[PDB]
Amino acid sequence: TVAYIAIGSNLASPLEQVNAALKALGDIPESHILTVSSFYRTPPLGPQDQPDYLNAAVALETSLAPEELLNHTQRIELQQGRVRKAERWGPRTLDLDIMLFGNEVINTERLTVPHYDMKNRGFMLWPLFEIAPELVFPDGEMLRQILHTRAFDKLNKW
Ligand SMILES: CC1(C)Nc2nc(N)[nH]c(=O)c2N=C1C(=O)NCCN1CC[C@@H](S(=O)(=O)C[C@H]2O[C@@H](n3cnc4c(N)ncnc43)[C@H](O)[C@@H]2O)C[C@@H]1C(=O)O
Ligand SMILES: [Cl-]
């Protein structure tokens, strides 16, 4: 299964957080990285008195079950760094979101895939388009069509 993971951080050195997270993701059992997007600097969505985010997307091939993958991404969020901040609306030391898990839809207490708001977030869609321009979502909608219709501004590189 190709999982697409969104990475974000705006605290505790986002470049260090993202590099450490990518290394850890590549070492998840039964998994390996196929592609990583460019690293982008994006203005915060939500409260404006917080630093800019580093956002990226990574295609990860995995034979893990979705919940098993989530166990590992959550373990990484806990093991990595000296301090974890995960406040609603930010700031965020490190988020590893499962944006898409193959073409599957999951709606459990722990896991909602596709990510529930990704179609409204340019900082998720543009890095994904860089690495999967022909992607079609589980509901049949085309990624390129969403970007055409919504006209999300393109992103600057970190
Ligand atoms: C401040 C804001 C809006 N502004 C930003 N601005 C820019 N420019 N750039 C950004 O990057 C950026 N980020 C921002 C931001 O808020 N980021 C956090 C995004 N995200 C993280 C995961 C979940 S969570 O509530 O933190 C944890 C629980 O979710 C459960 N869970 C369910 N489904 C999941 C899944 N598919 N993957 C992982 N966990 C999942 C899991 O079981 C846990 O209990 C929902 C949360 C959200 O979107 O609300
Ligand atoms: Cl969908």
mmCIF file with all atom_site columns, C-alpha atoms and ligand atoms in Angstrom:
data_model
loop_
_atom_site.group_PDB
_atom_site.id
_atom_site.type_symbol
_atom_site.label_atom_id
_atom_site.label_alt_id
_atom_site.label_comp_id
_atom_site.label_asym_id
_atom_site.label_entity_id
_atom_site.label_seq_id
_atom_site.pdbx_PDB_ins_code
_atom_site.Cartn_x
_atom_site.Cartn_y
_atom_site.Cartn_z
_atom_site.occupancy
_atom_site.B_iso_or_equiv
_atom_site.pdbx_formal_charge
_atom_site.auth_seq_id
_atom_site.auth_comp_id
_atom_site.auth_asym_id
_atom_site.auth_atom_id
_atom_site.pdbx_PDB_model_num
ATOM   1   C  CA  . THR A 1 1   ? 0.000   0.000  0.000   1.00 0.00 ? 1   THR A CA  1
ATOM   2   C  CA  . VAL A 1 2   ? 1.254   3.498  -0.814  1.00 0.00 ? 2   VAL A CA  1
ATOM   3   C  CA  . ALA A 1 3   ? 0.447   5.774  2.120   1.00 0.00 ? 3   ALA A CA  1
ATOM   4   C  CA  . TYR A 1 4   ? 0.805   9.530  1.643   1.00 0.00 ? 4   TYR A CA  1
ATOM   5   C  CA  . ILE A 1 5   ? 1.936   11.252 4.847   1.00 0.00 ? 5   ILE A CA  1
ATOM   6   C  CA  . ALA A 1 6   ? 1.757   14.992 5.445   1.00 0.00 ? 6   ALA A CA  1
ATOM   7   C  CA  . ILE A 1 7   ? 4.513   16.387 7.667   1.00 0.00 ? 7   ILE A CA  1
ATOM   8   C  CA  . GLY A 1 8   ? 4.274   19.747 9.405   1.00 0.00 ? 8   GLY A CA  1
ATOM   9   C  CA  . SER A 1 9   ? 6.155   21.664 12.072  1.00 0.00 ? 9   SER A CA  1
ATOM   10  C  CA  . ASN A 1 10  ? 6.447   25.305 13.101  1.00 0.00 ? 10  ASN A CA  1
ATOM   11  C  CA  . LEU A 1 11  ? 8.301   24.865 16.424  1.00 0.00 ? 11  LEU A CA  1
ATOM   12  C  CA  . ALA A 1 12  ? 11.588  23.543 17.795  1.00 0.00 ? 12  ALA A CA  1
ATOM   13  C  CA  . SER A 1 13  ? 13.452  23.915 14.469  1.00 0.00 ? 13  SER A CA  1
ATOM   14  C  CA  . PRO A 1 14  ? 11.069  22.647 11.760  1.00 0.00 ? 14  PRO A CA  1
ATOM   15  C  CA  . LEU A 1 15  ? 13.889  21.503 9.458   1.00 0.00 ? 15  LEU A CA  1
ATOM   16  C  CA  . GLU A 1 16  ? 15.417  19.395 12.234  1.00 0.00 ? 16  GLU A CA  1
ATOM   17  C  CA  . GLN A 1 17  ? 11.994  17.993 13.149  1.00 0.00 ? 17  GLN A CA  1
ATOM   18  C  CA  . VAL A 1 18  ? 11.147  17.077 9.557   1.00 0.00 ? 18  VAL A CA  1
ATOM   19  C  CA  . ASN A 1 19  ? 14.548  15.518 8.819   1.00 0.00 ? 19  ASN A CA  1
ATOM   20  C  CA  . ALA A 1 20  ? 14.379  13.411 11.987  1.00 0.00 ? 20  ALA A CA  1
ATOM   21  C  CA  . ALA A 1 21  ? 10.808  12.366 11.175  1.00 0.00 ? 21  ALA A CA  1
ATOM   22  C  CA  . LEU A 1 22  ? 11.703  11.284 7.632   1.00 0.00 ? 22  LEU A CA  1
ATOM   23  C  CA  . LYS A 1 23  ? 14.604  9.199  8.942   1.00 0.00 ? 23  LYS A CA  1
ATOM   24  C  CA  . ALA A 1 24  ? 12.269  7.588  11.482  1.00 0.00 ? 24  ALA A CA  1
ATOM   25  C  CA  . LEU A 1 25  ? 9.547   6.976  8.892   1.00 0.00 ? 25  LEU A CA  1
ATOM   26  C  CA  . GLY A 1 26  ? 11.991  5.177  6.611   1.00 0.00 ? 26  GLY A CA  1
ATOM   27  C  CA  . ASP A 1 27  ? 12.817  2.808  9.477   1.00 0.00 ? 27  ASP A CA  1
ATOM   28  C  CA  . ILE A 1 28  ? 9.201   1.886  10.230  1.00 0.00 ? 28  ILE A CA  1
ATOM   29  C  CA  . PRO A 1 29  ? 8.910   -1.926 9.973   1.00 0.00 ? 29  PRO A CA  1
ATOM   30  C  CA  . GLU A 1 30  ? 7.627   -3.274 6.669   1.00 0.00 ? 30  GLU A CA  1
ATOM   31  C  CA  . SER A 1 31  ? 7.922   0.184  5.073   1.00 0.00 ? 31  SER A CA  1
ATOM   32  C  CA  . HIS A 1 32  ? 10.167  2.350  2.917   1.00 0.00 ? 32  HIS A CA  1
ATOM   33  C  CA  . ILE A 1 33  ? 10.074  5.801  1.341   1.00 0.00 ? 33  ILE A CA  1
ATOM   34  C  CA  . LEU A 1 34  ? 9.260   6.019  -2.364  1.00 0.00 ? 34  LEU A CA  1
ATOM   35  C  CA  . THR A 1 35  ? 9.383   9.808  -2.830  1.00 0.00 ? 35  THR A CA  1
ATOM   36  C  CA  . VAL A 1 36  ? 9.545   13.017 -0.798  1.00 0.00 ? 36  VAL A CA  1
ATOM   37  C  CA  . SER A 1 37  ? 8.246   16.394 -1.911  1.00 0.00 ? 37  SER A CA  1
ATOM   38  C  CA  . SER A 1 38  ? 10.183  19.617 -1.674  1.00 0.00 ? 38  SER A CA  1
ATOM   39  C  CA  . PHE A 1 39  ? 10.151  21.338 1.714   1.00 0.00 ? 39  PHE A CA  1
ATOM   40  C  CA  . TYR A 1 40  ? 7.826   24.352 1.770   1.00 0.00 ? 40  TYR A CA  1
ATOM   41  C  CA  . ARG A 1 41  ? 7.456   27.402 4.016   1.00 0.00 ? 41  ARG A CA  1
ATOM   42  C  CA  . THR A 1 42  ? 3.787   28.177 4.536   1.00 0.00 ? 42  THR A CA  1
ATOM   43  C  CA  . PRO A 1 43  ? 1.932   30.852 6.511   1.00 0.00 ? 43  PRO A CA  1
ATOM   44  C  CA  . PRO A 1 44  ? -0.052  29.481 9.458   1.00 0.00 ? 44  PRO A CA  1
ATOM   45  C  CA  . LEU A 1 45  ? -3.650  28.450 8.919   1.00 0.00 ? 45  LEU A CA  1
ATOM   46  C  CA  . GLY A 1 46  ? -5.469  29.742 11.975  1.00 0.00 ? 46  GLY A CA  1
ATOM   47  C  CA  . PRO A 1 47  ? -4.001  32.029 14.635  1.00 0.00 ? 47  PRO A CA  1
ATOM   48  C  CA  . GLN A 1 48  ? -1.458  34.380 13.078  1.00 0.00 ? 48  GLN A CA  1
ATOM   49  C  CA  . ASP A 1 49  ? 0.850   34.886 16.092  1.00 0.00 ? 49  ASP A CA  1
ATOM   50  C  CA  . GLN A 1 50  ? 2.842   31.701 15.534  1.00 0.00 ? 50  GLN A CA  1
ATOM   51  C  CA  . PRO A 1 51  ? 5.774   30.902 13.231  1.00 0.00 ? 51  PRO A CA  1
ATOM   52  C  CA  . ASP A 1 52  ? 5.549   29.801 9.617   1.00 0.00 ? 52  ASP A CA  1
ATOM   53  C  CA  . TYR A 1 53  ? 5.281   26.044 9.003   1.00 0.00 ? 53  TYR A CA  1
ATOM   54  C  CA  . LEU A 1 54  ? 7.562   23.682 7.140   1.00 0.00 ? 54  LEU A CA  1
ATOM   55  C  CA  . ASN A 1 55  ? 5.239   21.384 5.168   1.00 0.00 ? 55  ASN A CA  1
ATOM   56  C  CA  . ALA A 1 56  ? 6.095   18.367 3.030   1.00 0.00 ? 56  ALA A CA  1
ATOM   57  C  CA  . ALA A 1 57  ? 4.530   15.160 1.733   1.00 0.00 ? 57  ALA A CA  1
ATOM   58  C  CA  . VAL A 1 58  ? 6.074   11.688 1.585   1.00 0.00 ? 58  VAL A CA  1
ATOM   59  C  CA  . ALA A 1 59  ? 4.931   8.575  -0.286  1.00 0.00 ? 59  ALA A CA  1
ATOM   60  C  CA  . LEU A 1 60  ? 5.598   5.539  1.942   1.00 0.00 ? 60  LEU A CA  1
ATOM   61  C  CA  . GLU A 1 61  ? 5.164   1.986  0.686   1.00 0.00 ? 61  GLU A CA  1
ATOM   62  C  CA  . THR A 1 62  ? 4.016   -0.232 3.542   1.00 0.00 ? 62  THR A CA  1
ATOM   63  C  CA  . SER A 1 63  ? 2.590   -3.676 4.259   1.00 0.00 ? 63  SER A CA  1
ATOM   64  C  CA  . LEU A 1 64  ? 1.343   -2.517 7.669   1.00 0.00 ? 64  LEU A CA  1
ATOM   65  C  CA  . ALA A 1 65  ? -2.323  -2.220 8.534   1.00 0.00 ? 65  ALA A CA  1
ATOM   66  C  CA  . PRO A 1 66  ? -3.438  1.437  8.748   1.00 0.00 ? 66  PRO A CA  1
ATOM   67  C  CA  . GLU A 1 67  ? -3.768  1.352  12.539  1.00 0.00 ? 67  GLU A CA  1
ATOM   68  C  CA  . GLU A 1 68  ? -0.307  -0.220 12.811  1.00 0.00 ? 68  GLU A CA  1
ATOM   69  C  CA  . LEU A 1 69  ? 1.122   2.605  10.708  1.00 0.00 ? 69  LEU A CA  1
ATOM   70  C  CA  . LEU A 1 70  ? -0.614  5.109  12.993  1.00 0.00 ? 70  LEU A CA  1
ATOM   71  C  CA  . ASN A 1 71  ? 0.910   3.403  16.044  1.00 0.00 ? 71  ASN A CA  1
ATOM   72  C  CA  . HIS A 1 72  ? 4.347   4.058  14.545  1.00 0.00 ? 72  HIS A CA  1
ATOM   73  C  CA  . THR A 1 73  ? 3.736   7.667  13.514  1.00 0.00 ? 73  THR A CA  1
ATOM   74  C  CA  . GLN A 1 74  ? 2.378   8.391  17.001  1.00 0.00 ? 74  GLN A CA  1
ATOM   75  C  CA  . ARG A 1 75  ? 5.377   6.643  18.583  1.00 0.00 ? 75  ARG A CA  1
ATOM   76  C  CA  . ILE A 1 76  ? 7.673   8.868  16.522  1.00 0.00 ? 76  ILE A CA  1
ATOM   77  C  CA  . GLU A 1 77  ? 5.786   11.985 17.632  1.00 0.00 ? 77  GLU A CA  1
ATOM   78  C  CA  . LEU A 1 78  ? 6.391   10.897 21.240  1.00 0.00 ? 78  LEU A CA  1
ATOM   79  C  CA  . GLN A 1 79  ? 9.978   9.648  21.006  1.00 0.00 ? 79  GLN A CA  1
ATOM   80  C  CA  . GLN A 1 80  ? 11.321  12.569 18.975  1.00 0.00 ? 80  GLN A CA  1
ATOM   81  C  CA  . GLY A 1 81  ? 12.695  15.735 20.507  1.00 0.00 ? 81  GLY A CA  1
ATOM   82  C  CA  . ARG A 1 82  ? 12.817  17.243 23.965  1.00 0.00 ? 82  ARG A CA  1
ATOM   83  C  CA  . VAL A 1 83  ? 9.251   18.567 24.163  1.00 0.00 ? 83  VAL A CA  1
ATOM   84  C  CA  . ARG A 1 84  ? 5.999   18.011 22.300  1.00 0.00 ? 84  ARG A CA  1
ATOM   85  C  CA  . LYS A 1 85  ? 3.497   20.778 21.591  1.00 0.00 ? 85  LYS A CA  1
ATOM   86  C  CA  . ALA A 1 86  ? 0.267   19.812 19.825  1.00 0.00 ? 86  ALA A CA  1
ATOM   87  C  CA  . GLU A 1 87  ? -2.157  22.631 20.640  1.00 0.00 ? 87  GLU A CA  1
ATOM   88  C  CA  . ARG A 1 88  ? -5.422  22.906 18.730  1.00 0.00 ? 88  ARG A CA  1
ATOM   89  C  CA  . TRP A 1 89  ? -4.866  25.514 15.978  1.00 0.00 ? 89  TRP A CA  1
ATOM   90  C  CA  . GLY A 1 90  ? -1.131  25.486 16.707  1.00 0.00 ? 90  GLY A CA  1
ATOM   91  C  CA  . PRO A 1 91  ? 1.747   25.744 17.269  1.00 0.00 ? 91  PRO A CA  1
ATOM   92  C  CA  . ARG A 1 92  ? 2.940   22.212 16.474  1.00 0.00 ? 92  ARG A CA  1
ATOM   93  C  CA  . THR A 1 93  ? 6.379   20.695 17.052  1.00 0.00 ? 93  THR A CA  1
ATOM   94  C  CA  . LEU A 1 94  ? 5.727   17.787 14.685  1.00 0.00 ? 94  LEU A CA  1
ATOM   95  C  CA  . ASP A 1 95  ? 2.630   16.379 12.992  1.00 0.00 ? 95  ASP A CA  1
ATOM   96  C  CA  . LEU A 1 96  ? 2.683   13.176 10.946  1.00 0.00 ? 96  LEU A CA  1
ATOM   97  C  CA  . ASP A 1 97  ? -0.751  12.921 9.314   1.00 0.00 ? 97  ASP A CA  1
ATOM   98  C  CA  . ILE A 1 98  ? -1.883  9.965  7.220   1.00 0.00 ? 98  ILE A CA  1
ATOM   99  C  CA  . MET A 1 99  ? -3.442  11.913 4.354   1.00 0.00 ? 99  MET A CA  1
ATOM   100 C  CA  . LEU A 1 100 ? -4.247  8.869  2.227   1.00 0.00 ? 100 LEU A CA  1
ATOM   101 C  CA  . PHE A 1 101 ? -3.788  5.127  2.735   1.00 0.00 ? 101 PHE A CA  1
ATOM   102 C  CA  . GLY A 1 102 ? -3.840  3.633  -0.711  1.00 0.00 ? 102 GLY A CA  1
ATOM   103 C  CA  . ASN A 1 103 ? -7.350  4.189  -2.035  1.00 0.00 ? 103 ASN A CA  1
ATOM   104 C  CA  . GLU A 1 104 ? -8.943  3.208  1.288   1.00 0.00 ? 104 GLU A CA  1
ATOM   105 C  CA  . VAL A 1 105 ? -11.480 5.080  3.410   1.00 0.00 ? 105 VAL A CA  1
ATOM   106 C  CA  . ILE A 1 106 ? -11.241 4.672  7.193   1.00 0.00 ? 106 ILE A CA  1
ATOM   107 C  CA  . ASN A 1 107 ? -13.524 6.311  9.747   1.00 0.00 ? 107 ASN A CA  1
ATOM   108 C  CA  . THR A 1 108 ? -12.729 5.029  13.252  1.00 0.00 ? 108 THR A CA  1
ATOM   109 C  CA  . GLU A 1 109 ? -12.361 6.651  16.648  1.00 0.00 ? 109 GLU A CA  1
ATOM   110 C  CA  . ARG A 1 110 ? -8.607  6.764  16.006  1.00 0.00 ? 110 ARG A CA  1
ATOM   111 C  CA  . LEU A 1 111 ? -8.209  7.168  12.239  1.00 0.00 ? 111 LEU A CA  1
ATOM   112 C  CA  . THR A 1 112 ? -10.016 9.179  9.562   1.00 0.00 ? 112 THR A CA  1
ATOM   113 C  CA  . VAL A 1 113 ? -8.593  8.760  6.042   1.00 0.00 ? 113 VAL A CA  1
ATOM   114 C  CA  . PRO A 1 114 ? -8.599  10.713 3.770   1.00 0.00 ? 114 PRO A CA  1
ATOM   115 C  CA  . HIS A 1 115 ? -7.628  13.453 6.191   1.00 0.00 ? 115 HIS A CA  1
ATOM   116 C  CA  . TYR A 1 116 ? -10.895 15.179 7.000   1.00 0.00 ? 116 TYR A CA  1
ATOM   117 C  CA  . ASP A 1 117 ? -9.909  18.667 5.796   1.00 0.00 ? 117 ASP A CA  1
ATOM   118 C  CA  . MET A 1 118 ? -7.110  18.120 3.266   1.00 0.00 ? 118 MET A CA  1
ATOM   119 C  CA  . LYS A 1 119 ? -9.206  19.277 0.301   1.00 0.00 ? 119 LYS A CA  1
ATOM   120 C  CA  . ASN A 1 120 ? -9.328  22.754 1.894   1.00 0.00 ? 120 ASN A CA  1
ATOM   121 C  CA  . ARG A 1 121 ? -5.591  23.002 2.712   1.00 0.00 ? 121 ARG A CA  1
ATOM   122 C  CA  . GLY A 1 122 ? -3.158  24.177 0.046   1.00 0.00 ? 122 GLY A CA  1
ATOM   123 C  CA  . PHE A 1 123 ? -0.192  23.266 2.247   1.00 0.00 ? 123 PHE A CA  1
ATOM   124 C  CA  . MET A 1 124 ? -1.313  19.628 2.005   1.00 0.00 ? 124 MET A CA  1
ATOM   125 C  CA  . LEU A 1 125 ? -2.455  19.563 -1.630  1.00 0.00 ? 125 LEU A CA  1
ATOM   126 C  CA  . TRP A 1 126 ? 0.465   21.313 -3.346  1.00 0.00 ? 126 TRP A CA  1
ATOM   127 C  CA  . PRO A 1 127 ? 3.212   19.011 -1.942  1.00 0.00 ? 127 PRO A CA  1
ATOM   128 C  CA  . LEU A 1 128 ? 0.989   16.023 -2.760  1.00 0.00 ? 128 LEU A CA  1
ATOM   129 C  CA  . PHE A 1 129 ? 0.530   17.275 -6.334  1.00 0.00 ? 129 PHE A CA  1
ATOM   130 C  CA  . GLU A 1 130 ? 4.313   17.569 -6.674  1.00 0.00 ? 130 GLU A CA  1
ATOM   131 C  CA  . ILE A 1 131 ? 4.729   13.829 -6.013  1.00 0.00 ? 131 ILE A CA  1
ATOM   132 C  CA  . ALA A 1 132 ? 1.405   12.465 -7.358  1.00 0.00 ? 132 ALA A CA  1
ATOM   133 C  CA  . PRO A 1 133 ? 0.026   14.841 -10.021 1.00 0.00 ? 133 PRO A CA  1
ATOM   134 C  CA  . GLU A 1 134 ? -2.412  12.257 -11.443 1.00 0.00 ? 134 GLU A CA  1
ATOM   135 C  CA  . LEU A 1 135 ? -3.928  11.344 -8.070  1.00 0.00 ? 135 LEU A CA  1
ATOM   136 C  CA  . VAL A 1 136 ? -7.663  10.654 -7.815  1.00 0.00 ? 136 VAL A CA  1
ATOM   137 C  CA  . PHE A 1 137 ? -9.321  10.634 -4.394  1.00 0.00 ? 137 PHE A CA  1
ATOM   138 C  CA  . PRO A 1 138 ? -11.528 7.796  -3.098  1.00 0.00 ? 138 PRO A CA  1
ATOM   139 C  CA  . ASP A 1 139 ? -14.702 9.766  -3.911  1.00 0.00 ? 139 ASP A CA  1
ATOM   140 C  CA  . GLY A 1 140 ? -13.561 10.060 -7.547  1.00 0.00 ? 140 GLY A CA  1
ATOM   141 C  CA  . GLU A 1 141 ? -12.439 13.700 -7.414  1.00 0.00 ? 141 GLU A CA  1
ATOM   142 C  CA  . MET A 1 142 ? -9.207  14.560 -9.241  1.00 0.00 ? 142 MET A CA  1
ATOM   143 C  CA  . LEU A 1 143 ? -6.444  16.326 -7.321  1.00 0.00 ? 143 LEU A CA  1
ATOM   144 C  CA  . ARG A 1 144 ? -5.580  18.535 -10.309 1.00 0.00 ? 144 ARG A CA  1
ATOM   145 C  CA  . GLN A 1 145 ? -9.240  19.549 -10.577 1.00 0.00 ? 145 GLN A CA  1
ATOM   146 C  CA  . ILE A 1 146 ? -9.383  20.649 -6.935  1.00 0.00 ? 146 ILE A CA  1
ATOM   147 C  CA  . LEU A 1 147 ? -6.297  22.842 -7.398  1.00 0.00 ? 147 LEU A CA  1
ATOM   148 C  CA  . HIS A 1 148 ? -7.750  24.317 -10.591 1.00 0.00 ? 148 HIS A CA  1
ATOM   149 C  CA  . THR A 1 149 ? -11.095 25.149 -8.956  1.00 0.00 ? 149 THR A CA  1
ATOM   150 C  CA  . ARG A 1 150 ? -9.906  26.418 -5.572  1.00 0.00 ? 150 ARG A CA  1
ATOM   151 C  CA  . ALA A 1 151 ? -6.924  28.415 -6.914  1.00 0.00 ? 151 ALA A CA  1
ATOM   152 C  CA  . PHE A 1 152 ? -4.848  27.858 -3.780  1.00 0.00 ? 152 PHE A CA  1
ATOM   153 C  CA  . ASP A 1 153 ? -1.704  29.967 -3.948  1.00 0.00 ? 153 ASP A CA  1
ATOM   154 C  CA  . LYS A 1 154 ? 1.455   28.058 -4.782  1.00 0.00 ? 154 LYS A CA  1
ATOM   155 C  CA  . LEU A 1 155 ? 3.986   27.611 -2.009  1.00 0.00 ? 155 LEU A CA  1
ATOM   156 C  CA  . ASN A 1 156 ? 7.444   29.021 -1.387  1.00 0.00 ? 156 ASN A CA  1
ATOM   157 C  CA  . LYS A 1 157 ? 10.332  26.707 -0.586  1.00 0.00 ? 157 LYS A CA  1
ATOM   158 C  CA  . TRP A 1 158 ? 11.853  26.491 2.890   1.00 0.00 ? 158 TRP A CA  1
HETATM 159 C  C1  . LIG B 2 .   ? -2.524  24.799 13.017  1.00 0.00 ? 1   LIG B C1  1
HETATM 160 C  C2  . LIG B 2 .   ? -2.750  24.183 11.692  1.00 0.00 ? 1   LIG B C2  1
HETATM 161 C  C3  . LIG B 2 .   ? -4.225  24.103 11.390  1.00 0.00 ? 1   LIG B C3  1
HETATM 162 N  N1  . LIG B 2 .   ? -2.205  25.152 10.771  1.00 0.00 ? 1   LIG B N1  1
HETATM 163 C  C4  . LIG B 2 .   ? -1.231  24.780 9.879   1.00 0.00 ? 1   LIG B C4  1
HETATM 164 N  N2  . LIG B 2 .   ? -0.827  25.776 9.026   1.00 0.00 ? 1   LIG B N2  1
HETATM 165 C  C5  . LIG B 2 .   ? 0.106   25.428 8.165   1.00 0.00 ? 1   LIG B C5  1
HETATM 166 N  N3  . LIG B 2 .   ? 0.548   26.375 7.288   1.00 0.00 ? 1   LIG B N3  1
HETATM 167 N  N4  . LIG B 2 .   ? 0.662   24.212 8.090   1.00 0.00 ? 1   LIG B N4  1
HETATM 168 C  C6  . LIG B 2 .   ? 0.277   23.135 8.955   1.00 0.00 ? 1   LIG B C6  1
HETATM 169 O  O1  . LIG B 2 .   ? 0.857   22.073 8.798   1.00 0.00 ? 1   LIG B O1  1
HETATM 170 C  C7  . LIG B 2 .   ? -0.739  23.511 9.888   1.00 0.00 ? 1   LIG B C7  1
HETATM 171 N  N5  . LIG B 2 .   ? -1.162  22.542 10.774  1.00 0.00 ? 1   LIG B N5  1
HETATM 172 C  C8  . LIG B 2 .   ? -2.093  22.855 11.609  1.00 0.00 ? 1   LIG B C8  1
HETATM 173 C  C9  . LIG B 2 .   ? -2.615  21.727 12.418  1.00 0.00 ? 1   LIG B C9  1
HETATM 174 O  O2  . LIG B 2 .   ? -3.569  21.923 13.198  1.00 0.00 ? 1   LIG B O2  1
HETATM 175 N  N6  . LIG B 2 .   ? -2.019  20.531 12.256  1.00 0.00 ? 1   LIG B N6  1
HETATM 176 C  C10 . LIG B 2 .   ? -2.462  19.369 12.961  1.00 0.00 ? 1   LIG B C10 1
HETATM 177 C  C11 . LIG B 2 .   ? -3.245  18.612 11.959  1.00 0.00 ? 1   LIG B C11 1
HETATM 178 N  N7  . LIG B 2 .   ? -3.939  17.354 12.333  1.00 0.00 ? 1   LIG B N7  1
HETATM 179 C  C12 . LIG B 2 .   ? -3.049  16.404 13.088  1.00 0.00 ? 1   LIG B C12 1
HETATM 180 C  C13 . LIG B 2 .   ? -3.727  15.103 13.421  1.00 0.00 ? 1   LIG B C13 1
HETATM 181 C  C14 . LIG B 2 .   ? -5.087  15.233 14.051  1.00 0.00 ? 1   LIG B C14 1
HETATM 182 S  S1  . LIG B 2 .   ? -4.880  15.497 15.851  1.00 0.00 ? 1   LIG B S1  1
HETATM 183 O  O3  . LIG B 2 .   ? -6.347  16.043 16.494  1.00 0.00 ? 1   LIG B O3  1
HETATM 184 O  O4  . LIG B 2 .   ? -3.652  16.683 16.161  1.00 0.00 ? 1   LIG B O4  1
HETATM 185 C  C15 . LIG B 2 .   ? -4.484  13.924 16.671  1.00 0.00 ? 1   LIG B C15 1
HETATM 186 C  C16 . LIG B 2 .   ? -5.560  12.834 16.655  1.00 0.00 ? 1   LIG B C16 1
HETATM 187 O  O5  . LIG B 2 .   ? -6.114  12.572 15.366  1.00 0.00 ? 1   LIG B O5  1
HETATM 188 C  C17 . LIG B 2 .   ? -6.266  11.182 15.167  1.00 0.00 ? 1   LIG B C17 1
HETATM 189 N  N8  . LIG B 2 .   ? -6.261  10.988 13.745  1.00 0.00 ? 1   LIG B N8  1
HETATM 190 C  C18 . LIG B 2 .   ? -7.405  10.773 12.995  1.00 0.00 ? 1   LIG B C18 1
HETATM 191 N  N9  . LIG B 2 .   ? -7.150  10.649 11.717  1.00 0.00 ? 1   LIG B N9  1
HETATM 192 C  C19 . LIG B 2 .   ? -5.778  10.806 11.610  1.00 0.00 ? 1   LIG B C19 1
HETATM 193 C  C20 . LIG B 2 .   ? -4.943  10.776 10.519  1.00 0.00 ? 1   LIG B C20 1
HETATM 194 N  N10 . LIG B 2 .   ? -5.413  10.562 9.252   1.00 0.00 ? 1   LIG B N10 1
HETATM 195 N  N11 . LIG B 2 .   ? -3.589  10.965 10.676  1.00 0.00 ? 1   LIG B N11 1
HETATM 196 C  C21 . LIG B 2 .   ? -3.155  11.186 11.947  1.00 0.00 ? 1   LIG B C21 1
HETATM 197 N  N12 . LIG B 2 .   ? -3.891  11.236 13.097  1.00 0.00 ? 1   LIG B N12 1
HETATM 198 C  C22 . LIG B 2 .   ? -5.213  11.036 12.869  1.00 0.00 ? 1   LIG B C22 1
HETATM 199 C  C23 . LIG B 2 .   ? -5.235  10.478 15.971  1.00 0.00 ? 1   LIG B C23 1
HETATM 200 O  O6  . LIG B 2 .   ? -5.836  9.320  16.453  1.00 0.00 ? 1   LIG B O6  1
HETATM 201 C  C24 . LIG B 2 .   ? -5.072  11.526 17.156  1.00 0.00 ? 1   LIG B C24 1
HETATM 202 O  O7  . LIG B 2 .   ? -5.930  11.277 18.262  1.00 0.00 ? 1   LIG B O7  1
HETATM 203 C  C25 . LIG B 2 .   ? -5.933  16.336 13.421  1.00 0.00 ? 1   LIG B C25 1
HETATM 204 C  C26 . LIG B 2 .   ? -5.164  17.635 13.162  1.00 0.00 ? 1   LIG B C26 1
HETATM 205 C  C27 . LIG B 2 .   ? -6.225  18.531 12.445  1.00 0.00 ? 1   LIG B C27 1
HETATM 206 O  O8  . LIG B 2 .   ? -6.076  18.638 11.182  1.00 0.00 ? 1   LIG B O8  1
HETATM 207 O  O9  . LIG B 2 .   ? -7.106  19.060 13.148  1.00 0.00 ? 1   LIG B O9  1
HETATM 208 CL CL  . CL  B 3 .   ? -12.328 11.345 -0.891  1.00 0.00 ? 2   CL  B CL  1
#
